[PDB]
Amino acid sequence: TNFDQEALLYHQQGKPGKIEVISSKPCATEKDLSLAYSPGVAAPCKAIAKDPAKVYDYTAKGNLVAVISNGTAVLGLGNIGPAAGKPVMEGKGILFKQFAGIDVFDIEVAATDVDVFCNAVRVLEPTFGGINLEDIKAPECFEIEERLKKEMNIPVFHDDQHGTAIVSGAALLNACSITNRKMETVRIVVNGAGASANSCAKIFIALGARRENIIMCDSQGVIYKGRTAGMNKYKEYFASETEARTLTEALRGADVFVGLSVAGALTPEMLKDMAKDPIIFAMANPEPEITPDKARAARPDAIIATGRSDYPNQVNNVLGFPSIFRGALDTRSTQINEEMKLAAVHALAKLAREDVPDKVSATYGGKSFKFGRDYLIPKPFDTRVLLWVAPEVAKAAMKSGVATRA
Amino acid sequence: TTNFDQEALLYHQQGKPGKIEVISSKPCATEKDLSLAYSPGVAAPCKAIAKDPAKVYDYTAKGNLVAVISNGTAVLGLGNIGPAAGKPVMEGKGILFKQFAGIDVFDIEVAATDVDVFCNAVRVLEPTFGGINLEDIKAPECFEIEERLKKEMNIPVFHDDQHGTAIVSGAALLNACSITNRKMETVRIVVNGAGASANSCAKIFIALGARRENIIMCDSQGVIYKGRTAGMNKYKEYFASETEARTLTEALRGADVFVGLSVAGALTPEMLKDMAKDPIIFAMANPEPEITPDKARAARPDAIIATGRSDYPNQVNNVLGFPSIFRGALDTRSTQINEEMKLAAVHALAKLAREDVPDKVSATYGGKSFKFGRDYLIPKPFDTRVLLWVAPEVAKAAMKSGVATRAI
Ligand SMILES: [Mg+2]
Ligand SMILES: [Mg+2]
C-alpha cells in the first residue's frame, strides 16, 4: 500500500515520532536558568510543600493528561504489546493538543495483569491532571478503570469504553427528536460485547431509555438471563428477559440498532422488520454493518450513523474526550463522572441543531448541512465543539461537587 | 533573598502554568494530516514494531526521550517534601536536558517511598522511554533503587545526584593534580559528608588511579574509621579507613584534597593551614560553600578551589555530565550507562578544559578571559564544545564495552 508507505515515512522522517517537549518559558541565559532550575526553582517547591493545591499554579499539571496503555487492544490490531502501541498513544496525544489544547505524556506500560498495571499507574498521580486509558482489552479494561477511579484522586477515563456511547447517545437523542420518539419507549438492540457495548446501554438508560427495552447480543446471539455459554459478569448485568435468542428475532420491531460487530451483520431482512424510521448505528470498522445506501435501498426511512467520515453522521470519538478533559481540567476536578458525561451528550446534541457556519461548509467541500436525518451531530472538525461542550462539562463538575476550582 | 524567590514564583506562573509544553513535530492540522498521525495510517508503524521491536526507535520519540523520575524524598536541599512539591524541579531538570543535549523529557513524579513499589512502577515503563534519569531520591533508598533498576531494565538508568558531582569533580581533580604535578596514586583525599554523592566520588577517584588507603571519608560524627559502629551502615563502612584521625581537623593535616559535600563553614582556615602544599579544595556545600575562594586564598595563597556556585571559578555543575552522557547512550541505543561510560565522560571533560578557550566562550561570559590553570580546571557550563567532546566519547565507550545496540 502506498498509503502505508506514506504513514511510515511520516513517522520516520525528520525528528522520529510525532512529539517534542519544549520550554514554555525563557531558558537561554544564566539568569533564566537560575529561575527554571537551582536556586530559584526551590521557591515554587516550597510553596507547594506548604499548600499542595499550588502544584496547579506552578507546574504543567493542570493541562497535562497521561494517555496510558498496555497495548493489549491497539486499534483493530489486537494484543500487539506496549511498544507497538506507542505510535497510537503519541497520536492520541496529538488529538488532545489539536482539539483541546491539552498537553499529553503518552505512557506505554508493560503490564497485562490488572493489579500490577493498576499498582504501577496509580502512583503516577502527582504528575498528571487526568488519565486517559486507551487500547486496553476487555474484560481487563473494565476492572482497571473501576479500580483506578477508586484509588486515584484525579480523573480516570477509558475513551474506548465511553467515547462511542457519548457521541452515539447525542446522535440518538436527535434521531428520536426528529422521529417523534420518547426515550422511555424506544427499543434498542446492541450487537457486540466489546469494550464500548455496556457503556452504550448505560448512557442510553441515563438518557431515559428503559433497561427492559434494551437487548444486548454477542457472537453467540442474544444475551438472556439464565444463559451460561460465553457469559461473564459484564454481559450478565444487561441480560434480557426477552424470549429472543438471535439478533434477527431481537430486531423485529426494534427502533434502534447499535452495531459494534462486523460488516454485513445487518441484513435487509432484519432491516425489513424494524419499526418505521429505523435508527441504525453501524459502528463496525473498517467496514460498517451496512452502508447508508444499502440501508436506504432496503428501508428508505432508515436513519444511519457510522464510524466513517465518508458518510453523514460520523460517530467520531474526537467529539467527546477533548471537551470532557478540557472541562475536567479547567475545574481541577477529581473525577470525570456520569454527570459530566451526560452533560457532554446533551451539549453535543444541542450543537447539531444550531445553524452550520460558513467555514464548516468550507472545511467539508462546500457541503451544506442542516439539522435532520443527514446531520444529527456536529462534524469532527467543527471548531465550535470545544466552546460548546467543555463549559457544560465544567458546569456539571461544579454542580456535582467534584470541581476543586470555581 | 525572598524577592528572588518572588522572581522565580512569577516565572513559574506567567503565561502558561509550569515550564513545559508538548507539541507535534509533524503536520497535524488537516484530516489528511491526521489520517497519518492517527487512524488509519498510524496502524502501519504499529504493525512494523510488532514484527520488529527495535523499530520503536524509528517511528516514535523513544530514541530521544528520557524520563526524569523522582519520589521527591530529597529535593535539592529541601529534603523530603514529596512528589508534587518536587515537580518544578523535575520539569526544570527536563529543561536542562533539552537545552544542553536536545533531549526530550517526560518528568514523572511518583508517590512511592517503598523501594519495591517504586521499582515495580518504574520498571514497567521501559517501553515508553529511551533512558531513565533518577533524581532527588533520598539515601539509602536511592542506592537500592538504582542498583535494582539498572539490573532489571534494558535501557540506561542513571541517578544523577549520586554520580554527577563525582564525574565532574573527578575531571576537575585530574586537572588539579596535573597542574600541581601530582600522581593520582599518591594523592590523599578527604571526603566530608556522607550523602548520596559521597561513595560515588570515592569510586570515581579510584577509577582515576587513587588508592583506598589514601581516601578518608567523614560525616556528622567525624571520621568514618574501620571498626566504627556509631551511626554506621552498609555504605559508610565500604570506605572506612585505618587512620588514627577521628576529627575532620585531624584528617586534613598533610592532606592534598578536601571534598566538601557538607555545610557552610565546615572548612576553617586552621585546618586549611595544615594541608599539603598546593591544597585542592572542592567546596560543594549548597548554597554556601564550606569556604569561599577568597577566604581560602587568604588562609592559603597556594590553594586551588572549586565550588557549586556559578559565582566563582571552577563550578562543579552537574549539567556538564548528564546531558552528554544520555546523548551518547541514546544515540548508540545502549542498554546501560556503565562505569566505562562514566569514566569516558570524566576524561573528556578534563581534556576539554586543557584546550585553548575560543572567543565564543569569552563572549558568552561577558568577555572574561579563560586559560587552563588554577582558575579554570573544568569547562564552563555554557561552552557548546562540551556536548561535542563528551557525547562521542560516551558513545565510543558504550560500543567498546558492548552495551551499544547501534554503531555510530
Ligand atoms: Mg483506542
Ligand atoms: Mg537533584
Author numbering:
A (entry chain A): 16 to 421
B (entry chain B): 15 to 422
Show sentences the authors wrote.
Bacterial hybrid malic enzymes (MaeB grouping, multidomain) catalyse the transformation of malate to pyruvate, and are a major contributor to cellular reducing power and carbon flux. Distinct from other malic enzyme subtypes, the hybrid enzymes are regulated by acetyl-CoA, a molecular indicator of the metabolic state of the cell. The larger ME isoforms (hybrid enzymes) are predicted to be a fusion of two unrelated enzymes; a catalytic N-terminal ME subunit and a C-terminal phosphotransacetylase (PTA) domain. The PTA domain is homologous to PTA enzymes (that interconvert acetyl-CoA and phosphate to CoA and acetyl phosphate), yet they appear to lack critical catalytic residues and thus acts as a sensor instead.
We solved the crystal structure, to 1.67 Å, of the first 434 amino acids of MaeB, corresponding to the N-terminal catalytic domain (MaeBME). Structurally, MaeBME closely resembles the fold of small prokaryotic MEs, which form a tightly interacting dimer where the catalytic site is composed of residues from both protomers. Dimerisation in solution was confirmed by size-exclusion chromatography. MaeBME can be divided into three subdomains: region d1 which contains a Rossmann-like fold that forms the nucleotide binding site; region d2 which is mixed α/β and contains an N-terminal extension that sits over the dimer interface and extends into the opposing monomer; and a small “hook-like” subdomain (residues 369–386) that has no structural equivalent in other characterised ME folds and is best-described as a projecting loop with central alpha helix. Comparatively, the hook region is easily discerned as an insert in the primary sequence of hybrid MEs, and packs against d1 via several conserved hydrophobic residues. Each of these catalytic residues is in an equivalent pose to those from the eukaryotic enzymes, with the difference that Y52 is contributed from the other monomer rather than on the same chain. Our truncated ME construct (MaeBME) retained activity, but was insensitive to inhibition by acetyl-CoA, CoA and acetyl phosphate, confirming that these allosteric inhibitors act at the appended PTA domain.
